[PDB]
Amino acid sequence: KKKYEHVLKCRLSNRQKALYEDVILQPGTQEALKSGHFVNVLSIL
């Protein structure tokens, strides 16, 4: 010549915790994480 990057962690909500743990229980997620092929993980995105 003004710019400085400062990214820091953010905070979660317990309703979001409940809903996330709710959705987590689909077994297709398990077989996907084990297989490592995108044909299944496309959904959870």
Side-chain angles (χ1 to χ4, degrees):
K1 299 289 95 175
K2 77 194 186 66
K3 64 186 289 295
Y4 314 84
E5 184 63 5
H6 306 261
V7 292
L8 280 298
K9 310 174 185 199
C10 310
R11 286 49 158 168
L12 297 77
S13 80
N14 285 318
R15 186 181 200 185
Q16 280 160 325
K17 268 161 68 158
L19 272 285
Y20 163 101
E21 302 314 331
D22 188 358
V23 66
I24 279 290
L25 273 293
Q26 195 276 346
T29 66
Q30 291 74 331
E31 61 81 19
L33 268 178
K34 273 84 184 165
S35 70
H37 189 196
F38 168 83
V39 291
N40 310 130
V41 74
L42 73 165
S43 71
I44 62 159
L45 314 175

